[PDB]
Amino acid sequence: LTKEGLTAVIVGLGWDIRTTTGTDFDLDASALLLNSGGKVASDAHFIFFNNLKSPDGSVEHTGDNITGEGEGDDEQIKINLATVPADIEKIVFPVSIYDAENRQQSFGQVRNAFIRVVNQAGEAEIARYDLSEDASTETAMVFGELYRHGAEWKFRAIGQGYASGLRGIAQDFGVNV
Numbered sequence: 008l009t010k011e012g013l014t015a016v017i018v019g020l021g022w023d024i025r026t027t028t029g030t031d032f033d034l035d036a037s038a039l040l041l042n043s044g045g046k047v048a049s050d051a052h053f054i055f056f057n058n059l060k061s062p063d064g065s066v067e068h069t070g071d072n073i074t075g076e077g078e079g080d081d082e083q084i085k086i087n088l089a090t091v092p093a094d095i096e097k098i099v100f101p102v103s104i105y106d107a108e109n110r111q112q113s114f115g116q117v118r119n120a121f122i123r124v125v126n127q128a129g130e131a132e133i134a135r136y137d138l139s140e141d142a143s144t145e146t147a148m149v150f151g152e153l154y155r156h157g158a159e160w161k162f163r164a165i166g167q168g169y170a171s172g173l174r175g176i177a178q179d180f181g182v183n184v
């Protein structure tokens with residue numbers, strides 16, 4: 008009498024604190040909630056360090072970690088798919104290094120950098136990306152997206168790099184930034 012949908016998910020980003028002297032590694036997890044035209048539903052549907060919750064309340068970022076201090080996921084974005092508004096069709100997950108050009112930083116310099124998505128109904132890992140190893144030369148990437156498939160939600164890994172940083176990503180998806 009049990010049937011069948013992803014309903015609550017957590018995206019987790021972690022990395023290790025820089026051991027050499029120099030500016031810290033400040034990685035950032037973001038989310039963009041898109042409409043059926045692939046555009047952010049409003050500028051406040053870009054969830055990041057300066058906007059930690061969606062207006063609808065379905066997507067919340069737990070807070071900005073600017074060094075990597077702490078084990079496991081250093082930043083998390085919690086998504087309650089049940090309460091995502093109907094107008095939202097996809098939620099895309101960028102990962103970036105803050106101020107990477109000025110700091111001359113890339114994922115390959117950072118130790119044990121990973122991003123993952125966990126199905127909270129049972130803590131099963133859905134997908135992981137090894138940023139240190141597989142996005143070595145990158146400073147910003149789209150990890151993946153949750154998307155509607157009929158009445159349910161699925162995840163799709165994307166793994167696409169962007170040379171123009173988090174701002175460039177935000178621009179492509181129609182954020183006024």
Ligand SMILES: [Ca+2]
Nearest residue numbers: 034035072073
């Ligand atoms: Ca951060």
Ligand SMILES: [Ca+2]
Nearest residue numbers: 022075076077
């Ligand atoms: Ca850490």
